[PDB]
């Protein structure tokens, strides 16, 4: 009879702005609730717990939660989403005074803050001896999105983020390779949405 | 609590038996089987509160397990399937959920072991015209051909593993997406400036670590026996 809902398998948030990760529960008296993080190749991390105890509950770099009786709810939130806060989240709740139960996740992406996009496609050669190449799509803001590619022998990745710590410095890229004769970096992103003001060198 | 799982890694065949086992220090009389799946968050499979008390949890079916001891709790799949591919979780709890996880076992499970099959790796140099463009120059890692999807890519400058400038696809794709036995690939990205770049002395290595065969598998084909092993591609630093 008890059980736990998390609204969303995948969520963004724009950096800088609220988190807000949503958790309500089916259990007619009040359970113990639970809230986990798993970072990316990782195991489960416990962030906070609600012990019947405080109503408000906080846990390490910010993260809290409220116990709402009356709505069923127990929402994990953080002040400002940091590009290090990507990961799954999981809420969970004691069932049958014998174990803890699982949500089925929600993974959080964070939207970098991209304030002089400078979008791209770039041809990249294998460093060793090759007729073979990669297309590079980068430095797009998060208002660009990457299609799947209509043809059977192009490969195109999603959108991945990374981060130079050494400039301090995020960028989007995906990544799009074929072995075909007639594949040319200009038509690679033919099926994707892309800024009209895309960079195309020679 | 201290609590320890073996194996970390398996790759096995559909049809056998395989044993997955949970150990702790501390003691607790509970015990948990769970296993994690993409969308459905970790679900239990059986759990135990003393030597010889076994209880299902919502996905029993196809697993056995025992409870040989306080410190000891064994997952069995008793007859492998496919969509038994999934990371497992053992646990411990207090008398207050307290809960102590192992550090998982990924177990990946195949019809035929012929189609295993390492990626091969390969590095490609940043273009020109990003570094001309932008000062920096993304270096892009890809790994192809590899079965089943079971994998580590990782990046190493001058001898030492990074981290920072880094962004790997969170799955492999599929070259061959109508088939059940696709095999898989998948990028890396690694940006650099384009000063770093064009140091000659500077040293690039993409690492994809592949889990496949051990030794005790029996290999028919001439191809190479397709081991678990390292597979690496490289470039060094270009002035021109």
């Known amino acids: 009879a008890q059980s736990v809902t998390q609204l969303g398998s995948h969520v963004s948030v724009s950096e800088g702005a609220l988190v807000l990760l949503r958790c309500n529960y089916s259990?007619?008296?009040?359970?113990?609730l639970f809230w986990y993080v798993q970072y990316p190749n990782q195991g489960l991390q416990l962030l906070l717990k609600?012990?019947?105890?405080?109503?408000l509950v906080k846990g390490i770099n910010g993260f809290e939660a409220e116990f709402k009786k009356s709505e069923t709810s127990f929402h994990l939130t953080k002040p400002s989403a940091h590009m290090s806060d990507a990961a799954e989240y999981f809420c969970?709740?004691?069932?049958?005074?014998?174990?803890?139960?699982f949500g089925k996740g929600t993974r959080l992406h964070i939207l970098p803050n991209i304030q002089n996009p400078d979008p791209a496609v770039y041809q990249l050669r294998d460093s060793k001896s090759s007729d073979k190449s990669v297309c590079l799509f980068t430095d797009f803001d998060s208002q660009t999105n990457v299609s799947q590619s209509k043809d059977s022998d192009v490969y195109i990745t999603d959108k991945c983020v990374l981060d130079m710590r050494s400039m301090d410095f995020k960028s989007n890229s995906a990544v799009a390779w074929s072995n075909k004769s007639d594949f040319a970096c200009a038509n690679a992103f033919n099926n994707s949405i892309i800024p009209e003001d895309t960079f195309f060198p020679s | 609590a201290d609590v320890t799982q073996t194996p970390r890694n398996r790759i096995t065949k559909t049809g056998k038996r395989i044993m997955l086992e949970c150990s702790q220090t501390?003691?607790?009389?509970?015990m948990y089987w769970y296993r994690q799946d993409p969308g459905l968050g970790l679900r239990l499979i059986y759990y135990?509160?003393?030597?010889?008390?076994?209880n299902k949890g919502e996905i029993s079916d196809g697993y056995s397990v025992s409870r040989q001891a306080q410190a000891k709790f064994s997952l069995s799949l008793e007859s492998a399937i496919p969509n038994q591919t999934a990371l497992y979780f053992c646990?411990?709890?207090?008398?207050?959920?307290?809960?102590?996880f192992g550090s998982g076992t990924r177990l990946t499970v195949v019809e035929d072991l012929n189609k295993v099959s390492p990626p091969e790796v390969a590095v490609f140099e940043p273009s020109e015209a990003e570094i001309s463009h932008t000062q920096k120059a993304t270096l892009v890692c890809l790994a192809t051909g590899f079965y089943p999807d079971h994998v580590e890519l990782s990046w190493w400058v001058n001898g030492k593993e990074v981290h920072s400038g880094v962004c790997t696809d969170p799955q492999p794709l599929k070259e061959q997406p109508a088939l059940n036995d696709s095999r898989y690939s998948l990028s890396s990205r690694l940006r650099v400036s384009a000063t770093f770049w064009q140091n000659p002395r500077n040293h690039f290595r993409c690492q994809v670590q592949f889990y496949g065969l051990s030794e005790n598998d029996e290999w028919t084909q001439d191809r190479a026996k397709p081991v678990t092993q390292i597979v690496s591609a490289e470039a060094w630093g270009r002035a021109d």
């Open positions: 646990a411990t709890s207090d008398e207050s959920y307290g809960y102590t």
């Open positions: 135990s509160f003393d030597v010889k008390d076994i």
């Open positions: 969970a709740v004691s069932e049958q005074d014998d174990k803890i139960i």
């Open positions: 259990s007619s008296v009040p359970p113990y």
């Open positions: 501390k003691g607790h009389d509970r």
């Open positions: 609600y012990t019947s105890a405080a109503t």
